[PDB]
Amino acid sequence: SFSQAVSGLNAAATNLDVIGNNIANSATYGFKSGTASFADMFAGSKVGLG
Amino acid sequence: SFSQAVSGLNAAATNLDVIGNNIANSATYGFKSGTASFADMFAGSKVGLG
Amino acid sequence: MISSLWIAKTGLDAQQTNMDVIANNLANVSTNGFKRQRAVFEDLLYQTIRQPGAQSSEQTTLPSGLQIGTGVRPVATERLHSQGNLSQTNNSKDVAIKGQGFFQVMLPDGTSAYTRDGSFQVDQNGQLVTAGGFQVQPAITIPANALSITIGRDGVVSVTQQGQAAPVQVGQLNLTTFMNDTGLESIGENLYIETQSSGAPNESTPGLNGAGLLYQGYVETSNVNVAEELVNMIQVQRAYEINSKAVSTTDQMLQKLTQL
Amino acid sequence: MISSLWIAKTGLDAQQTNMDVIANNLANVSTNGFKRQRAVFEDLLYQTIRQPGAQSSEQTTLPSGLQIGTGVRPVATERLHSQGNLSQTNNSKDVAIKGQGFFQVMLPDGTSAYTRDGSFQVDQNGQLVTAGGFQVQPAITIPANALSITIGRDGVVSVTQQGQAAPVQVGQLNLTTFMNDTGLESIGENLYIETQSSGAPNESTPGLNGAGLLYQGYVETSNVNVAEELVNMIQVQRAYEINSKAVSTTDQMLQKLTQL
Amino acid sequence: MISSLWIAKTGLDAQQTNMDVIANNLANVSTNGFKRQRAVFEDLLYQTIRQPGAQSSEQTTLPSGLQIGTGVRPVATERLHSQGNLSQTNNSKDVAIKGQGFFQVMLPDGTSAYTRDGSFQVDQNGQLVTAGGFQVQPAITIPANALSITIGRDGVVSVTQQGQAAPVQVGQLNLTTFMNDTGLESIGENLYIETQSSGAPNESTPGLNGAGLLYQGYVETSNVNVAEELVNMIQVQRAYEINSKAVSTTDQMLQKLTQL
Amino acid sequence: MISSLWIAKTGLDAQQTNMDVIANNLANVSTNGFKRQRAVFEDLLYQTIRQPGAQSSEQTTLPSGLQIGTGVRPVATERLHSQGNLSQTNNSKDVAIKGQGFFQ
Amino acid sequence: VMLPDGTSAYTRDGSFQVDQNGQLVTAGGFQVQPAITIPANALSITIGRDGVVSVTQQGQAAPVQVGQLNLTTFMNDTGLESIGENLYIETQSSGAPNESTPGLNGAGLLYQGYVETSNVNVAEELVNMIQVQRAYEINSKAVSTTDQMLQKLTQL
Amino acid sequence: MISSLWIAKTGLDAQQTNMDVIANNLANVSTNGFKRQRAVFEDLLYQTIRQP
Amino acid sequence: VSVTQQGQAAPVQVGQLNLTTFMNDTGLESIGENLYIETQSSGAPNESTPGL
Amino acid sequence: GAQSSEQTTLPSGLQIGTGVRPVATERLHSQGNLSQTNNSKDVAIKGQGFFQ
Amino acid sequence: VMLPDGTSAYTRDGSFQVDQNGQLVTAGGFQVQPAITIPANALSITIGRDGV
């Protein structure tokens, strides 16, 4: 729960960095916006890893 | 590990001193702003000094 | 004096090392061209007692014998060599690297150190020097009558004199790359020297076989991430407190025994 | 000199061994690729005196006769080989295992050891080694001018050179699986060696018949559950208290016999 | 009058010596340039009784005969001559060493002592003295109306005068290095004198021959690490308690002898 | 009454002196032209026992003998004579120093 | 370790010091075998896994090998004679001292920065003191009983 | 009881005097012909453990 | 009795520790130096592999 | 110091001592820290004098 | 050790002192041969492993 929560914290930070990069490039000719895709990291099926 | 953090606190205080001095001279003819540069104090690697 | 006490006395020291690394990283959050550290740990001795796999009978083996272990030791603190974010502080004397190369600087004793800090100054004689006063190599002199300094993406330093429409080339800045960037020995003042684990210094031009690119008016900031250091402090503090609790439990156990 | 004192001494030694195991587990919390250990005890000999089941009388037998037991002894310490939670260190050379495989390294002596920790570095010559400088086999040679190292899910190590849109394969990282994973002899330094109780090392590709998947930029932290360790510390302290009280009670009884 | 009493008395004395060293280390937390101490212990004599290796039979030997040992005694006290953490005192008169050098000062008796403490003052005559008033060597004298004192990384002391655009040199702060730094005899007042076990005084400038670099405005704090001292206090207390229990057991044995 | 107790007693006294220095520095924040104090300590005497460098055998010397030390003592309290921040009170009689002089 | 008289002793206490002429010696001043001389220009001394001692001097980017730490292995360890100050001398029960590199021929490894502590188990010794004391109190009572029996016999 | 405690109590009282002066200055903003106060402090006694 | 040799993932068998069993163990002759010798009331020393 | 022999002297002879006694109770006449009681009548001395 | 009559005796009591003319003597005052004479400006006397 301190490694499953850290993973979610880092994922949210990555998403926010992507959003900030999209905002900063509002006026940039030829720029394409970016989005982040997340996937779970299950192991056994009863033990989630974040 | 107390001196290492005290040094960082002092560096942040110096940065804020420079920022405050720059702000106070917003309207002062012939004023050139200041900038503080920092360098680490590694002793023999594998340990930090601040 | 007792085994668990030594083991928990190694746990305390390892967690103190982790806190030292975290605090040193947080203290240098603003120094340009900084690479943050990461401490790695490994298991100490493992007392054999009953040997694992020992032949108890003539046909039955003993699986996973009584392997009582000792505490922990740290192998080393390794530098996480990643590209710090570049900052546009718009000065002609600040240069930032985009790849994985290093600037070569000549130490006063005649040896050469390697630095990724790009905040360069000009001494009274006109040479490019590091902010600590160490002269850069292979020496780039700047005339007194200089109007503008232009350092291109290939490291060519040009100076435009008065009333002349063409720039004058005053040198060529080269980047040193190593087989192993982690093995370099940090000597402070944002300086690293060569060690035998870092191979040999391969000098290269900025854009060819693997030296990085130089951007003028840019400074390379540190790669330290504050939030991760905060979370790591919260976890190191808890681990240190729990190991101290183990020390206290051992102390209490030794009390009753002696009292008997 | 008296039986109860030997029994209580054995109990005290067993509880001290349990505390030593707990302290070793708590000292290796920050170690990557560490597995927590648990000790299992067995009761000692049983004095026969009156053989149960003997004829108590011509037509009747003795039900559950007089057996006097000795103390306790530890059988073995078993590891818990389970997947620890993954941690993102954002490093191109850190590798974590999702399944049940091990990395193979060569000791300087020429023998082969096995480690689950994936914190890898590169030496001065280019080969992938562990933190202790041991060379990962099968030898993976990273060339001088590498820009990025990609390690896939199936163990292929590729290097992307400058100006070439295709990546150059420079090795193949395999995983070794053993029938009995807990039977390996731990030599410390995060290293396990094969014993006769750990079967034979079966090499396999990471993704095939049961080797795990390799994740780049991830490290497998220890599986030590700390709250369980605190509760077990409480339990061990109380058990040591009770055994010491038994020793003290036996001491008080022998005193009255001396006084006689 | 009984062997065990003398042995346990020696043990008590050794533990008291360990506690004395611990208290000395703890009392000097705020001392600049202080080095922590460690005690080394050895076995005392060994009563031979049976000779191990003697001829028991015509073709058999006596393996590991009856050797009875005496108590314990401290061998020696060793310092940990390592770099202490630096502290910024923002004073132009305070100098810190980054390597392994010593400052040479002159005692009032005319003999030279060596100190790593950098808290310097200027006397009424202008000579750079230490906090106790001993004159550094050489007499780095200071002019009358100095505005600022600049001590470089290589020991060059310069003074900036008024109306003069160039700093004047008033001395050269040198460092003394020894073959064995642990062999220097401590005399108090943060002063070490030469002995025959500390080699010879090698005078050198800061930066060459290994001697360290000088930082102006910083002081070298003590290297005492508190957590080790606390765990060692626990160790000393419990070992002292065990040895006192052994003394008490010997006392009860002797008393039982007296009653008969 | 025992050596370690005296050493710890000296350490306590030194730390108390440091606390007094800090308290004095704090009490004079609003004073004009005040220079803060800093205390410097020194390590006390050493009980010799075995002499470091004493010739044990005919040829081998004893390195780093049993130098059991006593506590600590404060040498001095030094002022930091540095130019404090100047404050404008706009008064015709208040004077401030820019360098390193003193009024008599 | 080489003793002043020239005969070699053996120790497991790994706390070493450099003497005034370089030279690694034990804390008692006896020189360790074989010879390692550390120069003045040394910045850091590293002792490897296999006992190789390397010294880093200023300027040189490559460490300079100085000496080799050779471990002496006996085949009967307990048969050694404890000569006092953390030293054992060979006897007829522990003959043939085999010099070897650490890690080879069954020899152990070297960890630098760590010292092996005593293996004395404390609870065992306390329980043994209890047993010894009560045993000395039951033998003393046997002495007293024999004395009383003799006094009664010789009184008539 | 302790020198540090007396020094800190004295510093507290001095800062309280400064606060009272500031409050009295603020309370008399609208008064005609008022002159605001300013407090001047000084160092107290200095014990000579070792004479400079 | 098996020993571990360096580099050999397998133990080397050295010997078997056999136990001698007597019929009337109480009839043995205690000769002093923690040794019993066979006496006509404790005859027939049967060597055996322990456990069998 | 007595002549133990015809040519030698006795060093440090047999002195058996009795217990311990208190000599004197001395006062430490130093300057205590000042406390301000906001009283027009309380006076404090700064040097080394006494009121009569 | 040298007896008053001039013949040499032998002792194992290692408690020695020094008399007023330098010189090491026993607790009884008899002088020890060989003759070892400690000077007056001595700061510390070390007796080594080999009797130096």
Side-chain angles (χ1 to χ4, degrees), chain A residues 13-29:
Chain A
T14 294
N15 191 2
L16 265 172
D17 296 3
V18 168
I19 292 160
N21 176 57
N22 287 359
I23 297 193
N25 279 286
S26 57
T28 299
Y29 296 129

Side-chain angles (χ1 to χ4, degrees), chain E:
Chain E
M1 90 176 253
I2 180 159
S3 184
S4 86
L5 190 72
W6 303 112
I7 301 176
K9 173 182 176 180
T10 56
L12 292 172
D13 286 295
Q15 301 294 347
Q16 171 65 19
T17 291
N18 204 356
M19 181 75 198
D20 282 346
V21 165
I22 270 176
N24 184 21
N25 283 344
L26 286 182
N28 287 13
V29 167
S30 312
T31 289
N32 300 301
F34 180 67
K35 317 300 229 193
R36 64 71 161 170
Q37 311 215 85
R38 186 193 167 202
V40 182
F41 301 103
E42 69 188 3
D43 299 35
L44 255 196
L45 315 192
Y46 272 98
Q47 320 200 75
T48 190
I49 325 284
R50 266 187 175 181
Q51 182 86 13
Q55 196 63 16
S56 84
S57 309
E58 191 146 10
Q59 31 183 110
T60 86
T61 77
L62 209 179
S64 99
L66 200 62
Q67 302 245 340
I68 278 296
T70 307
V72 72
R73 94 183 184 123
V75 157
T77 290
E78 40 171 3
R79 289 167 239 169
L80 171 80
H81 276 287
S82 84
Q83 174 65 69
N85 283 333
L86 297 175
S87 170
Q88 172 152 260
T89 165
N90 214 47
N91 217 31
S92 77
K93 323 206 188 181
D94 299 11
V95 200
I97 305 85
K98 190 199 182 177
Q100 41 269 0
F102 291 103
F103 295 121
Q104 175 179 4
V105 316
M106 207 201 40
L107 291 170
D109 294 11
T111 62
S112 285
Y114 304 96
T115 167
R116 214 161 151 81
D117 166 326
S119 272
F120 299 125
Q121 309 284 342
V122 158
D123 56 352
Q124 67 274 0
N125 292 147
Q127 268 90 62
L128 206 56
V129 303
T130 168
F134 308 113
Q135 294 248 347
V136 304
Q137 302 300 121
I140 314 289
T141 207
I142 287 273
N145 296 343
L147 291 93
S148 45
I149 280 74
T150 52
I151 301 173
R153 324 181 280 261
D154 53 288
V156 176
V157 182
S158 304
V159 174
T160 309
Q161 307 232 350
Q162 43 281 75
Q164 225 288 3
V168 316
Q169 171 158 0
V170 311
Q172 225 279 354
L173 193 63
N174 277 117
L175 295 171
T176 308
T177 65
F178 297 99
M179 181 45 68
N180 186 12
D181 302 336
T182 48
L184 289 168
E185 177 172 351
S186 299
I187 77 187
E189 333 165 53
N190 287 353
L191 295 171
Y192 306 131
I193 69 200
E194 202 199 277
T195 65
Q196 93 183 346
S197 152
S198 89
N202 285 334
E203 182 96 20
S204 99
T205 52
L208 288 323
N209 120 296
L213 295 176
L214 300 167
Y215 287 112
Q216 160 154 280
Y218 289 85
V219 294
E220 172 178 352
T221 61
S222 47
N223 49 3
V224 178
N225 153 266
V226 187
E228 179 185 354
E229 307 288 339
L230 290 170
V231 177
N232 291 338
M233 291 215 268
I234 289 174
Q235 274 173 200
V236 163
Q237 178 176 352
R238 297 302 188 210
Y240 206 86
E241 202 195 303
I242 304 286
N243 282 96
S244 88
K245 189 86 180 178
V247 162
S248 187
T249 299
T250 300
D251 208 4
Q252 313 274 130
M253 288 181 102
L254 274 173
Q255 160 204 339
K256 170 48 71 153
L257 256 200
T258 86
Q259 339 196 322
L260 285 196

Side-chain angles (χ1 to χ4, degrees), chain B residues 1-9 11-12 15 35-50, chain C residues 16 19-21 23-24 27-28 30-32 34 37 74-77 79 117 119 185-192:
Chain B
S1 163
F2 219 117
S3 317
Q4 327 203 323
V6 162
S7 72
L9 216 75
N15 229 314
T35 304
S37 294
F38 310 102
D40 52 24
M41 327 178 40
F42 258 99
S45 83
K46 274 271 307 164
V47 298
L49 291 186
Chain C
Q16 173 67 13
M19 181 63 55
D20 277 0
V21 165
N24 162 69
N28 288 327
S30 51
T31 88
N32 292 307
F34 183 69
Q37 293 187 346
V75 152
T77 83
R79 295 286 202 120
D117 191 1
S119 180
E185 179 172 353
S186 173
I187 61 176
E189 311 206 80
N190 278 354
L191 292 200
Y192 317 119

